[PDB]
Curated annotation (Swiss-Prot), chains A, B:
Species this protein is from: Bos taurus (Bovine)
Cofactor: Fe(2+)
Lipid sites, type S-palmitoyl cysteine: 219, 317-318
GO cellular component term of the entry, any: membrane
Record protein name field: Retinoid isomerohydrolase
Tissue specificity annotation: Retinal pigment epithelium specific.
Length: 521, 521
């Protein structure tokens, strides 16, 4: 790493905090643009222990909903814990009641039904007129975006046939929400279903009640689904990537009744499988039977996806290797001293942004040849006798233990479409270190960074009279735990330069946050 | 391609030329450094047809030996065809007598012994006090470096047990020559032998007569060796890369006696095998049984190789895919018009410079983890249950149909050792387009280029009082067929800047040349 952090400020990203009864006024450095009048809503953990019972993993902490509101002249900050079953039961009983991702709860009997986690710390997104905080299970939580108050719990299994769903659904311009999850295939097998929730209608009834299944992807292993964090979507195509990080459902049903495990205990890695890629015709609702294959890696975040003549351009934030990257994300290890953090990540998967290019229409004549005839890429697709199609990427970004993660674009105008710029959070040995801009064509980058300060995902907000793709700002929440300073602040950067425009400073700490959403109010 | 060549000047790289009875004086532009007093010797084809019988492939043309001599104030140029059997028989009979790589000769009987090609057009290199021009067979040709006169033919099978050898042997500082070739393994199989020729001795007897076998690499396929263009060498290790381009010996013995084929007709591609990598202890003369594996690609030129703690850093000029790149190098297609050349290379393998990193000492405890713990690389090595080690590279250079090829370094001081800079020939859709410098650490590059001019491999000559790695010049022969101009000229660039220092211009054309050698006279 170019940059070191011997002071260990990043510890404060994983430290419990309390709620606010009502919003704080933020002190403002610089000038806020007058056009920017909305609400930045983000999610993340906020309570990392229940008394003397600690949560162990990064994705175990109880969900905390954050809001930076730019209404009138000032900026305000507010935060409330989401009154989930996981939270409400824990506060009631002064203990950990619901098993989280990596923290297993124990009884204080008569067992009767597994209590799948409710803890929606990962993300928030809009369905119709409403907003839903979520995790990666079937339970999503309706919230009030004005007040941050918890409205309702929704069980997705009541409407669609899926076991869970990602916290990275795609939202179309008309409001239609797409998402992917595990299901049971028609013949004693596992598969992946694409869920479609339509936009609100004149009759005004709940859009979720009109949820449906578009298509079903098959599973490489009959009784083991891969882990799915997100997927790709274009106007005509749906793209799903099957990684070697498999879920071993066997283990959780065994240990639940017998010993007592958690979610992380079910994960295993398929050594010989590599990475399978899948395409579906979105409109015809067909799975296109094209056996795209490539070498092993973990994938959490798609960056963007789009069509180019008879090809799909697929940009991904990868991690080279089949070992589960989440292994490296226990809070005990993230709260280590800097020297020990770097040591711990030495044998970790190596991050790399990759452009994969999938030919849509294959022909047997070109068996044994590179099919990617596009002029401006070095990505490769080889047609074999297997009838499998072996892929090689065009690398866009690669730094030793430096990850371009939590990717974001101008999603409203360019999501699913040809594009040039992507923005992301820099991870220095897993510690969020800096903010990054990237030209996906030229590979040129820009970096914002300051010492002893640890920012969140950079969300792009378009200029209402934008002429270019990068015409707008980037919001990021920044934690600066240095001595004689403001614990944290919201950062606002000009998306062109990546230069600083303003700051909304606060007198209290903010923990790590994962994903969010800007609401143009 | 950024650069186009609609004029089609590159045609002149594949046009027959005659010899010179005696050297020409070159006209000099700029100032030649006073320290540079030696001989640049290069090889390549020079006769592309015998009357009305044409040679078809790039590597069929009859060998032509070139010399740029910087002796006293002036520069001189000379060239002679190498009096090989292939050449001598052809001139005698006014026809193609010996089957070349891609051009098959036909009878004008009683067959008795295959006549393997003598045509040493690829390269030249020194053994003891002598110099040997070579191809990729067992026949190498001794030449006079002062006069360019043909001295003798040498059959390597007379001394060592090998079927052939590469035109890319490694020469150590003490003069010892290492090289690799196909052999017959001890049990009815094929293998690869490392040949070692020692330096000249006090007794003054021929070093070749003291040739020996160091070690033997095994072959992935029992009856099919891969194609081997070059290999890697460090002070302690020998590195060999086994590609999916296999030789099908069956075919040549069948067609020779029956129909009548050539060398290119035996090549086939192993779809499912990928690329196997091999290491040997140079000193103990052992093959290290480590099953390094990775995805398919063609490899012709190693760039450099060196040791870093318990790791081998391996830099390669790759071509993504298992199809044989030589398919794309018939003279008929290289003499096409520019638009057709680009079309022909659309489905070709994509060039890419890659850094592969091989761990020397593997431990079972780390099975399923990334073993490459070095700080300044994104290359990966995964230990499996197979006990195979799956590799991912750190990409150093990647341009659409733009190849960094014919790589060269400051080989005397840094070959086999840690290094920073490498120099190469830019290939625009296979047409040699430009010259390149590359920082293998930072990836920063420099480019020299001028319109309607097509250069050769850039050879590095060190400054006698060098303080840095790039302290020296780069020689390249350049063909500028534009109207109202000097057909060709030798280019001399400052290796730091890649800026032009001088030119030795000539009034006659020079065809393509492959590899060479600077002789500090
Ligand atoms: Fe995520
Ligand atoms: Fe070569």
């Amino acid at each position: 790493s170019q940059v070191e952090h011997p002071a260990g400020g990043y510890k404060k990203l994983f430290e419990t905090v309390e709620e606010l009864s009502s919003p704080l006024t933020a002190h403002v450095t610089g000038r806020i643009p007058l056009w920017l009048t909305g609400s930045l809503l983000r999610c993340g953990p906020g309570l990392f222990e229940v008394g003397s019972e600690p949560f162990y993993h990064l994705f175990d902490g109880q969900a905390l909903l954050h809001k930076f509101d730019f209404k009138e002249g000032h900026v305000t900050y507010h935060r409330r814990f989401i009154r989930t079953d996981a939270y409400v039961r824990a506060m009631t009983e002064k203990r950990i009641v619901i098993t989280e991702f990596g923290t297993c709860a124990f009884p204080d009997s008569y067992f009767r039904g597994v209590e799948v986690t409710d803890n929606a710390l990962v993300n928030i997104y809009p369905v119709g007129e409403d907003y839903y905080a979520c995790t990666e299970t079937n339970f999503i939580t309706k919230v009030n975006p004005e007040t941050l108050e918890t409205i309702k719990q929704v069980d997705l299994c009541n409407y669609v046939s899926v076991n869970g769903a990602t916290a990275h659904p795609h939202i179309e311009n008309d409001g239609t929400v797409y998402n992917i999850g595990n299901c049971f295939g028609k013949n004693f097998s596992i598969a992946y279903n694409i869920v479609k929730i339509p936009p609100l209608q004149a009759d005004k009834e709940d859009p979720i009640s009109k949820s449906e299944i578009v298509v079903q992807f098959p599973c490489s292993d009959r009784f083991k689904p891969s882990y799915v964090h997100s997927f790709g979507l274009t106007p005509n195509y749906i793209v799903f990537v099957e990684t070697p990080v498999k879920i071993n459902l066997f283990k959780f049903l065994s240990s639940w009744s017998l010993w007592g495990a958690n979610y992380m205990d079910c994960f295993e890695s398929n050594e010989t499988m590599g990475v399978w890629l899948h395409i579906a015709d979105k409109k015809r609702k067909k799975y296109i039977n094209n056996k795209y294959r490539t070498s092993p890696f973990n994938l959490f975040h798609h960056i963007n996806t789009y069509e180019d003549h008879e090809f799909l351009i697929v940009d991904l934030c990868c991690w080279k290797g089949f070992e589960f990257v989440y292994n490296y994300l226990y809070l005990a290890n993230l709260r280590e001293n800097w020297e020990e953090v770097k040591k711990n990540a030495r044998k970790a998967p190596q991050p790399e942004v990759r452009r994969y290019v999938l030919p849509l229409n294959i022909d047997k004549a070109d068996t044994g040849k590179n099919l990617v005839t596009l002029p401006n890429t070095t990505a490769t697709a080889i047609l074999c006798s297997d009838e499998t199609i072996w892929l090689e990427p065009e690398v866009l970004f690669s730094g030793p233990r430096q990850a371009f993660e939590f990717p974001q674009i101008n999603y409203q105008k360019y999501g699913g479409k040809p594009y040039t710029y992507a923005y992301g959070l820099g991870l220095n040995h897993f510690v969020p270190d800096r903010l990054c801009k990237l030209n996906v064509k030229t590979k040129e980058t820009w970096v914002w960074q300051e010492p002893d300060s640890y920012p969140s995902e950079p969300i792009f907000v378009s200029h209402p009279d934008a002429l270019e793709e990068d015409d707008g700002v980037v919001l990021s929440v920044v934690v600066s735990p240095g001595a004689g300073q403001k614990p944290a602040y919201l950062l606002i950067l000009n998306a062109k330069d990546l230069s600083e425009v303003a700051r909304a400073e606060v007198e209290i700490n903010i923990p790590v946050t994962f994903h969010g959403l800007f609401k143009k109010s």
